[PDB]
Design an enzyme around this catalytic site. Structure first.
Site, short mmCIF file in Angstrom:
data_model
loop_
_atom_site.label_atom_id
_atom_site.label_comp_id
_atom_site.label_asym_id
_atom_site.label_seq_id
_atom_site.Cartn_x
_atom_site.Cartn_y
_atom_site.Cartn_z
CG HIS A 222 -0.47 0.27 2.58
ND1 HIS A 222 -0.39 -0.62 3.57
CD2 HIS A 222 -0.13 1.50 3.12
CE1 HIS A 222 -0.02 0.00 4.65
NE2 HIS A 222 0.13 1.26 4.37
CD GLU B 159 20.99 13.38 6.98
OE1 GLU B 159 22.17 13.62 6.81
OE2 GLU B 159 20.33 14.03 7.77
CG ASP C 132 0.08 -4.06 2.79
OD1 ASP C 132 0.63 -3.53 1.85
OD2 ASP C 132 -0.34 -3.40 3.72
N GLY D 233 1.48 6.79 8.76
CA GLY D 233 2.81 7.31 8.55
C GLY D 233 3.87 6.28 8.93
CB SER E 86 2.15 2.57 6.12
OG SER E 86 0.89 2.88 6.66
N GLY E 87 4.52 0.29 6.31
CA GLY E 87 5.69 -0.19 5.61
C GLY E 87 6.89 -0.38 6.55
N1 LIG Z 1 -1.47 0.01 13.86
C1 LIG Z 1 -2.44 0.85 13.46
N2 LIG Z 1 -3.51 1.09 14.24
C2 LIG Z 1 -2.34 1.43 12.18
C3 LIG Z 1 -1.46 0.89 11.24
C4 LIG Z 1 -1.39 1.38 9.96
C5 LIG Z 1 -2.16 2.46 9.60
C6 LIG Z 1 -2.12 2.97 8.18
C7 LIG Z 1 -3.22 2.36 7.28
N3 LIG Z 1 -4.54 2.82 7.68
C8 LIG Z 1 -5.48 2.08 8.29
O1 LIG Z 1 -5.34 0.93 8.73
C9 LIG Z 1 -6.76 2.87 8.50
N4 LIG Z 1 -7.67 2.29 9.46
S1 LIG Z 1 -9.07 1.70 8.77
O2 LIG Z 1 -9.68 2.95 8.14
O3 LIG Z 1 -10.01 1.16 9.85
C10 LIG Z 1 -8.80 0.40 7.57
C11 LIG Z 1 -8.42 -0.83 8.04
C12 LIG Z 1 -8.31 -1.89 7.19
C13 LIG Z 1 -8.53 -1.72 5.84
C14 LIG Z 1 -8.38 -2.81 5.00
C15 LIG Z 1 -8.56 -2.63 3.64
C16 LIG Z 1 -8.92 -1.40 3.14
C17 LIG Z 1 -9.10 -0.32 3.99
C18 LIG Z 1 -8.87 -0.49 5.34
C19 LIG Z 1 -9.01 0.56 6.23
C20 LIG Z 1 -3.01 2.78 5.83
O4 LIG Z 1 -2.31 3.76 5.55
N5 LIG Z 1 -3.59 2.06 4.86
C21 LIG Z 1 -3.44 2.37 3.44
C22 LIG Z 1 -4.83 2.41 2.85
C23 LIG Z 1 -5.63 1.14 3.10
C24 LIG Z 1 -5.68 0.93 4.61
C25 LIG Z 1 -4.26 0.79 5.10
C26 LIG Z 1 -3.04 3.01 10.52
C27 LIG Z 1 -3.11 2.51 11.81
CA LIG Z 2 17.84 14.18 8.46
#
Ligand SMILES: N=C(N)c1ccc(C[C@@H](NC(=O)CNS(=O)(=O)c2ccc3ccccc3c2)C(=O)N2CCCCC2)cc1
Ligand SMILES: [Ca+2]
Length: 223
Positions: free
Chosen positions: A40, A62, A84, A175, A177-178
């Site tokens: 993602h 860096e 993912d 932020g 993510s990854g």
């Molecule tokens: N450890 C955490 N609580 C955590 C971890 C990672 C993130 C970033 C992550 N965002 C979310 O999980 C948003 N929460 S969500 O809106 O409830 C969510 C969760 C699962 C889903 C699965 C498929 C498609 C959409 C989804 C959206 C993101 O950028 N995504 C890219 C776009 C698709 C969803 C993942 C946020 C929170």
């Molecule tokens: Ca720096």
């Protein structure tokens, strides 16, 4: 990272920032030319920034290297987030040393209860947004499959695991993510998704890297 602590400059030497004029995702250096992150996080025009601590200041140490190719897993499904994971090849090899170094791929999956280190420059607030300058760290245990599936009924595949705290207050967030989930010196997870950030009974969900070691190796060997 919500509820974490300032890691200290360069104490997580495998942590990468993916940058397209701003930090948008993290990643992990697994050898001098390859980074692993989440599918993602795919975007064209990625510059990988290594040896970072304050992402807004050049401080020394860096290395900025463009991505020459990003390889999203062929079976990544954007609706479920199953598979993912993405590999990024660097245009040139990074210079590895104390402050920039690779993390080892696991030889076996980690068990419930294993404590791991999660890090990133993501949001530090549950309700609201506050992005840090420096890298934040969080120690968190891998949860059992039964607790993980109870928290997210029907949404957990065998390529996912939960890690974190059911009481709320400590989690990865937007932020991060990854980014890496490192347990006993091995990369076990990639920050993938969660419901909100640091919410009670909604732990973070991570890509289970142990299921992908053969695909990572075979893919790097053919590219
Ligand atoms: N450890 C955490 N609580 C955590 C971890 C990672 C993130 C970033 C992550 N965002 C979310 O999980 C948003 N929460 S969500 O809106 O409830 C969510 C969760 C699962 C889903 C699965 C498929 C498609 C959409 C989804 C959206 C993101 O950028 N995504 C890219 C776009 C698709 C969803 C993942 C946020 C929170
Ligand atoms: Ca720096």
């Amino acid at each position: 990272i919500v509820g974490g602590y300032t890691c200290g400059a360069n104490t997580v030497p495998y942590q990468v920032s993916l940058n397209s004029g701003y930090h948008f995702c993290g990643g992990s250096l697994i050898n001098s030319q390859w980074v692993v992150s989440a599918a993602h996080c795919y975007k064209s025009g990625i510059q990988v920034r290594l040896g970072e601590d304050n992402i807004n200041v050049v401080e020394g140490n860096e290395q900025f290297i463009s991505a020459s190719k990003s390889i999203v897993h062929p079976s990544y499904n954007s609706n479920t987030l199953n598979n993912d994971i993405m590999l990024i090849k660097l245009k040139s090899a990074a210079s590895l040393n104390s402050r920039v170094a690779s993390i080892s791929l696991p030889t076996s999956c980690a068990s419930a209860g294993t404590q791991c280190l999660i890090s990133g420059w993501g949001n530090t607030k549950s309700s609201g947004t506050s992005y840090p300058d420096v890298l934040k760290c969080l120690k968190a245990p891998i949860l059992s499959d039964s607790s993980c599936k109870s928290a997210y009924p029907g949404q957990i595949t065998s390529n996912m695991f939960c890690a974190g705290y059911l009481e709320g207050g400590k989690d990865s967030c937007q932020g991060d993510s990854g980014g890496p989930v490192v347990c006993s010196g091995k990369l076990q997870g990639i920050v993938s998704w969660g419901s909100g950030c640091a919410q009670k009974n909604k732990p973070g969900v991570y890509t289970k890297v142990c299921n992908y070691v053969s695909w990572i190796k075979q893919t790097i060997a053919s590219n």
